[PDB]
Each structure stands twice: as structure tokens, then as C-alpha cells.
Design a protein around this ligand. Structure first.
Ligand code: HPA
Ligand code: HPA
Ligand code: HPA
Lengths: 247, 247, 247
């Protein structure tokens, strides 16, 4: 159904990797050779565009935008697209986002790869699903091989890449200083309103996952770098993909 | 629509301040000169009465009662009234409630002003809202100037006023001793089932916020003063308002 | 309505105790003298079978299975059955489940009775209920007299019985290592996706509650005994019931 349309649309392009673009990274859609832009509304069932082509000399699909849980209160907003990506032969999903840092040592404009997360005030996107596949193990949701490759790519470009735990809050209002003190007490390094439900759905669909946050601000109570933060992340990603033949 | 009705009803009274009355304080509606009582059912859209008149020689609207999240599972129950208050020219919202104390040093009958909160098992009232106004900063949700005035008024009446962080639980069942141990570990000073969603909505609508809890009990596992607690709070409020010309 | 059917079905059997059977314990339904099996679909309103008869020489109802919050997103799934049990004259509810251990000292195959719980990412089953009965005190949700009897029965059989706090996560995906570190930091000894909403509903309906988890695994990041774990629990339960005349 959705799979059918995209297959027609893709020239017979066969990407192994898809990238969900967070705020600040929307522009990456432009640096895509032989690009094929598909609006979300053309795609039946999809909840804002899908772009497929060559990036870093390798075939990719990008989602410019995503629907967040806070928008309609639907944590499974991204279920159908993620399923569709899986059915197109994508084996790897890279998720990017904007986040607040809970660490002095990790200022705005820093990039942090996710090694784990905490679902705090989100809802679980697999509620209402049937069959035993729903009991998804999440011990290594963030693929160890991909997390290493990203680290190696950052070192090759000589960009700092932090590592840490992302805590998901529903939003859309930001956190109070007390909620931020709690988040830290609970073990998070950064907070945000996205990504986690897509990681869960990805693991449900058998996709390997990497993720990274651009730090745009310190968390509330601790008191624009979002563009250079994003250019840093893009450079790590590009380098990561060129170095990977079978990635 | 709702604004229209209240404007007709209010004699051309123009309050800057509204007070949401928690359990125990319902009676304050009676000590209101030139009072104008409006039942909630007369007001179209409202989810229990609205009372406007002179209090402490100053124009006020009071909500005797509120709809809690636990009643129908609607965290935005109070959205329409709070919006309506804003549209009537109210610039300041004072929220009162009953809460459980997590501090030995803060017994039943104490009054605690809120300097911050933690939304624990509530839902965010702005889920499903559109436009960038929904990304409400909550760094100083509890107005610093109002929190000081309340403190000064308490000292002038020689009433103790505690200060602390309120944690919101959905309810309607109370917390277990283990949940109370957690609440403290997470940094709360008091717990309850109200207020926080109205603070969020208020900040969304540009209103300055003050809040205070009457402590009616210690939190579960730590083991009637609710009336004197309320009379203490009323005395602080009255004093706060008489001392403020432009409040 | 549901009460009517079960009364007809029960031969005029009058159980004081009901047992909700978790994964692994379904088989206990077989060791029930004079058994009367009733499928859930025969029972009007029920959300998988109800079995009543003699167990350990005493009259009992067992629920083989339960509907979890994660299945349809309905935390009050078990409301109607629990109410129905109360209306049949059941005064005591024993809940069993599978759980993950957060303690080295409590390995897979251990049995842990619940002395308290933490509702973490569950929803409260009493949201949407009317009347003052909904404000259920939960200071001693796990009956002290029943918890002692279970302990005494374990010692008589010479089985180890741990004691601790169960934290409820919605599921259906399992917890990340970071969520497990948090659960411990918040004071839990074991985690799972069940039981807590039924404890709340039970207390709402005036039933005394005992609960126990079979430990099937360590919690994520810390790295089959579920059958012997269950046989241990069954032995404690049997011994507990034979020793109780008025239990
Ligand atoms: O501090 C934050 N909190 C939540 N979401 C965010 N997205 C960017 N920064 C933040
Ligand atoms: O201890 C409490 N818990 C929750 N709500 C409350 N409202 C008054 N006291 C309490
Ligand atoms: O580790 C666990 N987590 C959640 N539910 C469970 N049920 C059995 N083990 C577990």
C-alpha cells in the first residue's frame, strides 16, 4: 500500500539507511544527489517530506520532519512510516534531534550520541499491538557497532562527540528547574520531546538504530548554536557513511 | 462566546486577579462584597461556581471548585475557563489547593507557597494544541514578584509560610509509602492531584501565577487542620491584596 | 448481571478467596477438585478462563489470565471481573505475576511477596470513577496479616520468600538499562507490567490483597527458572490456605 507507492517513486533506488531529521537539520534534504522529493500527503497513511537519493555517495531516504507525541497525543504517529521504511529494505535508522543538556561540560552546539534512553512522560508506542513481537528487548536499543562507527567518524573529522542517556518528556511546554533536577537525579544527560518512540518502533520492526542530539540549550534552571551543532552532526554522519561500504 | 456572557453578567466589573479555590476554601466566596454568583452550567463551554465582586476592597473573580484530571481523564478540563479569565482582563491567577506534606517540619495546617512543581503522573494540558505558543517556557512559572509579596504579607500577619516544590500525581487514589519515598527522592516537598495543569495553561495564556497549598496531612507512610490552614491562607491573601494597589 | 451468571454456574459454591494467575501459573487451574470451568466469553461484560472449585481443601475462584494495560491501553480492563468477585463474596484477592529482579541477591526462580508498589508508567484505573469511594487510601494496600501468613507458610515449607517493592511499567517493550537503574534509584526491588492496577481496584472494592512475583530474569543491563519459581509459589499458597480456616 504505502510500500507500493514509494517503490514506484524511487527509480528502483534501494537504500539501506534512512535518516529522520530533527529541527535544525531539515536543510540536509538539499545536499542529496539525484534527489526525489515526495510530500507526506501523497503517501497514503502517512500522518514534512520524504527525500531519497545519493548522500555521501550512498543511497538514502530522509524524513524531513516527524510528527511528535505532543501534537495529537499519538505516540505511534511514526509507526506507519517506520514500518514502510523497513518494507523498503532499510536496515539502519539514524535519528537526530534537538535536546537540552543537563551537563555543564556539554554546552549548546555540542553533539551527543544516544547510548540509552529513559521514557519519562511519554507513552509507549506499542500499546494496542498484537502478537509476541511487541515484547521487544531494549537492552542494546542503540546498536553498539553503529555507535562505534559514529565515534570513529567524529575522531576522523576531529569533532567532539559526547555520549549519554536521553530522557523523553511529552512536552510541548518545557521542563521546570525541579523537573530538570529530577531528570539528572534519574540518570539522564539530556532531555527532549522526541526520538524515543521511534527507537522503540524501530526495534519492534527489527531495524538497527543510531541516534544523536544536537544540544541547543542548557536545561531549565541551569541558567544560537543549533546551526553549528547541526553542521557538526552532518559532518560526522557524512564521514560515517562514506567510510561504510556495508553500513 | 463565554467571554460575552461574563461581560454582560459582571456589572462592568474589571478584575485583574482571579482565584481558583481548592478544597477547604470554597467558603471564601461568601466574603465578597457586591457579589455576583454565576453557576458553571449557565456559562457555555465551562466543564461549582464563578463569583465576582469586591474582596479585600479590590475587584476579583473566584472559581469555587475546579475539574480535576482524575474526574474524566482530561488534563485540559480547565482550559476554557482559564482562557476566558484571560480574555476578561485578568492578569494574575492565584491557585490554592490541599496537599500532603513530605516534610516533618511542615505539619498539617501549614501553608506552603509553590516556588516550582514536578508533573509526575499528570498529562500535559497542551497536548493537541497548535502554533508555537505551545512551547511554553516554565523556568519561572511561579512569578517571583508575586511570591515575594505573599511572603511579605505572611510576615506582616505573622503567619508562617513555607516554600517548596509540589509534585502532581493523577489520583484519585492516594500514594503508597514507596511512592512518597520516591517523591521526596525526586525533590518534592508536597504532593497532590491538582493545580499544575492550570499553572501550565495559565503560562500558556500569558497570566502571572502564584500558588499555595494548605497541608492537610503527612504523606502516606510517614504515619482536622484543613480549616485553620485555610484561614491562615485567606489571611495572607487578604493582606497581600490590600497592600497591592497595582497587583 | 455478571454476578447472576456466575452464581448459577457455581453449584452454590461460596469462595472467600480468588487468585489471579500470572504467566507460568496457568496450570494451577488443573489441580482443582470438583472444578467448574467458565470461559471469559460466556461471562457478559468480561474483557482466559474463570475456574472455581476446591483447592487445598478450600473453596476458590481462579482467573487463568488477565488483560493487561498494554493490550488495549485500558488500565481498568480488570475492573468488571474484580467487582464481580467482590459481589460473589470473595474477601481476599491473591495476585501473582512474573517480574524482573533489580537485586543480585534475588535471582531468577526466586519468589518475592509484594509489601508495596510504585505506579511508574501505568495509568490509574479509577480515573473516570464517581463518588468519594475513589479516594482510596493505599498506606497498607498489601494486607499485613496476609503477608505474615504467607511468610509463615514459606518457612513451614522451607522455601525462601523475598519481600519488596514492585514498580509497574506499562510495557509491552521491556525496560532499558537506564530505566532499570532509575527504578532502583526510585526504590523498587522488582519491575513488571501487571498487578498494580488490580491491587488499586481491589482496595477500591474493599478486598484484602496479597501479591507475589515469580522472578524470571534480572532487569536489563544487569547482564528457564520460571517453572520452579511457580512451583515454589504454588507450594507457599497451598500451605498458606490449608493452615487458614478463616482466611
Ligand atoms: O530543554 C529542552 N527540553 C525539551 N526539549 C528540548 N528541545 C530542545 N531543547 C529542549
Ligand atoms: O497526601 C495527599 N496526596 C494526594 N493528594 C492530597 N490532597 C491532600 N492530601 C493529599
Ligand atoms: O524485566 C522485566 N520487565 C518487565 N516485565 C517483566 N516480566 C517478567 N520480567 C520482566
Amino acid at each position: 500500500p504505502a510500500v507500493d507507492l514509494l517503490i514506484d517513486r524511487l527509480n528502483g533506488l534501494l537504500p539501506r539507511i534512512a535518516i529522520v531529521l530533527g529541527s535544525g537539520l531539515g536543510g540536509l534534504v538539499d545536499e542529496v544527489e539525484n534527489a526525489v522529493r515526495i510530500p507526506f500527503a501523497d503517501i497514503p497513511g502517512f500522518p514534512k517530506e520524504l527525500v531519497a537519493g545519493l548522500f555521501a555517495g550512498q543511497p538514502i531516504i530522509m524524513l524531513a520532519g516527524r510528527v511528535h507525541y505532543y501534537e495529537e497525543g499519538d505516540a505511534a504517529a511514526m509507526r506507519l512510516p517506520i514500518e514502510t521504511l523497513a518494507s523498503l529494505g532499510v536496515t539502519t535508522l539514524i535519528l537526530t534531534n534537538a535536546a537540552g543538556s543537563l551537563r555543564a561540560d556539554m554546552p549548546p552546539g555540542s553533539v551527543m550520541q544516544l547510548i540509552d534512553h529513559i521514557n519519562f512522560s511519554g507513552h509507549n508506542p506499542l500499546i494496542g499491538e498484537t502478537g509476541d513481537g511487541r515484547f521487544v528487548g531494549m537492552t542494546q536499543a542503540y546498536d553498539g557497532e553503529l555507535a562505534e562507527a559514529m565515534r570513529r567518524a567524529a575522531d576522523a573529522e576531529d569533532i567532539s562527540l559526547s555520549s549519554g542517556v536521553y530522557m523523553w518528556f511529552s512536552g510541548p511546554s518545557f521542563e521546570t528547574p525541579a523537573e530538570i533536577r529530577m531528570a539528572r537525579t534519574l540518570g539522564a544527560d539530556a532531555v527532549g520531546m522526541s526520538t524515543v518512540p521511534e527507537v522503540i518502533l524501530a526495534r519492534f520492526f527489527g531495524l538497527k538504530v543510531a541516534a544523536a542530539s544536537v544540544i541547543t540549550n542548557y536545561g531549565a534552571g541551569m541558567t544560537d548554536m543549533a546551526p553549528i551543532g547541526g553542521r557538526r552532526l552532518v559532518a560526522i554522519l557524512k564521514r560515517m557513511i562514506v567510510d561504510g561500504g556495508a553500513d
